[PDB]
């Protein structure tokens, strides 16, 4: 068979490496020398801690990882391609800093689009990421943003996560809707931020070809409601994520989760303080309030991605070969 992806050396970063390092933090450790790191990549409108303090920072620590995260400024609202420089740099650093050992990446919302962008276009990290555990990823963007012609002034990453954007087009045409490392995608038909998610099929924004694609309603029934934040914080998500992180295959396993795990409330192993914070988690909507970059057209694609979106309109014009 065949699966094609970009090849060669990694494209150059627009940000200096010191600036990208400044966006990476590990709890209790230095990225230069870390035991069993996991890289956490946050959603639009949030920092690492705002997305994960109430959930996978303590949960991954109790599973024996050192939690590390990136907080691309300002609040993941800048150009998704620049947010991805933070992720690629972080994988490079943490892979070296754990002894040249592959490490897992765990994400929410835009974070997963960033992880898959980096894996598609930065070949050096494909052998450095052990597995990807993505919660409500928007690999096709979301139809609840926009539409394409109604985006004036919006932050850069909001233009880019609108359905039909040049960025989501380039990702798809370059082969990035197929999993590149073992990947598990946990998402919900009742996500109020990322749609469409209702088909349990490759139409869903969270779906990756050959991924372990887990729509909550496929397991727990069509009347099982779990919202965007709940997709990250629930006991169901914890059982699936724990299975993915420990699996000998790199993906969650059906033998490990099932209807006995269909609990949409905050993960059982969180403290009561943590469950309260998780159940109240409003981070997905932080981008409605925070000050972002001003952007009057969809950000241009970097040269490594531009050839995959011929005919789409960005700041410079309509992409050609």
Author numbering: -3 to 317
Manuscript text:
Here, we choose lipase B from Candida antarctica (CALB), as the model enzyme, in which Asp187-His224-Ser105 is the catalytically active triad. We succeed in evolving cysteine-CALB mutants that are even more active than WT CALB.
In order to gain insight into the basis of increased activities of QW4 and QW10, the crystal structures of both enzymes were solved and refined to 1.85 and 1.88 Å resolution, respectively. Surprisingly, Cys105 in variant QW4 appeared to be oxidized to the respective sulfinic acid. Directed evolution of cysteine-CALB with generation of mutant QW4 led to a distinct improvement of activity for a range of bulky substrates, which are not well accepted by WT CALB. Interestingly, the nucleophile exchange (S105C) in QW4 results in a conformational change of helix 277–288, compared with QW10 or WT. While the helixes of QW10 and WT CALB are well superimposable, the helix section P280-Y282 of QW4 is deformed and shifted toward the active site, with an additional H-bond between Y281 and E188 formed. This conformational change also induces loop 289–294 next to helix 277–288 to shift by about 3.8 Å towards the solvent.
